[PDB]
Ligand binder design. Structure first.
Ligand SMILES: O=C1C[C@@H](C(=O)Nc2ccc(I)cc2)c2ccccc2N1
Length: 305
């Protein structure tokens, strides 16, 4: 039994993090095959970060102005392009540790493991979620730029996130590996406000389902509710509106626990209206929304990659 916030084994991604240096700036890069991906803000000075013209800055930069180092090995850059907000550096050697990879753009509410790095070496790995405002609440210090988020499909590492900037609010924003920012965020040191962050209701229901599987059953009520009426309560407490698609995704969990979705949604309504009265669910005095329904069935059924 037991239920903890798990992250995918970072081994396959460790053999792909390299160090990227342009002038004075040094951040982490992703070396897949013969290409190195890194945030394009590596090409700016400290003054340019206010209003940077990246296309003009890249024009002045040649191949010999970029330094790629995988551990203690300098890779010779042969071509530099700029796909959206990602700098693509064509190196000479194909990474012999490139796994079966795939570039995906995750939807809000999905979770992914982050391998935080500095100067090309991994420091730690944690599991975070894509907030509905297209931000993430992670731990990144200076030099963490270029740290990648990923999911592992048994053998295929699905790269989905690359850290770019910490918003002044303390949250973090990034792009997919194609360069497109997750959200309305541009790469410049300017007052950028995120949207209103809701609570992933479907993920909370999966977390409540995980609690029933792992012992905790105090929140289970004798009541039930309908979909629209529960959404009227979810709107009050800034919770994501629930759809029939979410009910069917929670289908596998509902069958294993013998508790219908609308009956679990009723137990959630009481927790939103009456609080928790100082109790705890799976060691948490607050409702958790960083576990997708697929993350629960991974830990509650047992699969390996
Ligand atoms: O998450 C982080 C990562 C790191 C950072 O990304 N800097 C940054 C770089 C380019 C732009 I354009 C905008 C921002 C950082 C440096 C110093 C203090 C806190 C943080 N927090």
């Amino acid at each position: 039994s037991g239920f903890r916030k798990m992250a995918f084994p970072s081994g396959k991604v460790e053999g792909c993090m390299v160090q990227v240096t342009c002038g004075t700036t040094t951040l982490n890069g992703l070396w897949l095959d013969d290409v190195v991906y890194c945030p394009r803000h590596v090409i700016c000075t400290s003054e340019d970060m206010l209003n940077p013209n990246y296309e003009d800055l890249l024009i002045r930069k040649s191949n010999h102005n970029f330094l790629v180092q995988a551990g203690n090995v300098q890779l010779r850059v042969i071509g530099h392009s700029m796909q959206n907000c990602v700098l693509k550096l064509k190196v000479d050697t194909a990474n012999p540790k490139t796994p079966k990879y795939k570039f995906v753009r995750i939807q809000p509410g999905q979770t992914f493991s982050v391998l935080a790095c500095y100067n090309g070496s991994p420091s730690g790995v944690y599991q975070c979620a894509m907030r509905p405002n297209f931000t993430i609440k992670g731990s990144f210090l200076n030099g963490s730029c270029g740290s990648v988020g990923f999911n592992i499909d048994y053998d295929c590492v699905s790269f989905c996130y690359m850290h770019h900037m910490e918003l002044p609010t303390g949250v973090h924003a990034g792009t997919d590996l194609e360069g497109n920012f997750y959200g309305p965020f541009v790469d410049r040191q300017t007052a950028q406000a995120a949207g209103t962050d809701t609570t992933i209701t479907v993920n909370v229901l999966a977390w409540l389902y995980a609690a029933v599987i792992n012992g905790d059953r105090w929140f289970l009520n004798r009541f039930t509710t309908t979909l629209n009426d529960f959404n009227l309560v979810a709107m009050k407490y800034n919770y994501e509106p629930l759809t029939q698609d979410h009910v069917d995704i929670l289908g596998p969990l509902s069958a294993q626990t013998g508790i219908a979705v609308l009956d679990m949604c009723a137990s959630l309504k009481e927790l939103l209206q009456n609080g928790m009265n100082g109790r705890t669910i799976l060691g948490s005095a607050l409702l958790e929304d960083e576990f997708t329904p697929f993350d629960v069935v991974r830990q509650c059924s047992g699969v390996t990659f």
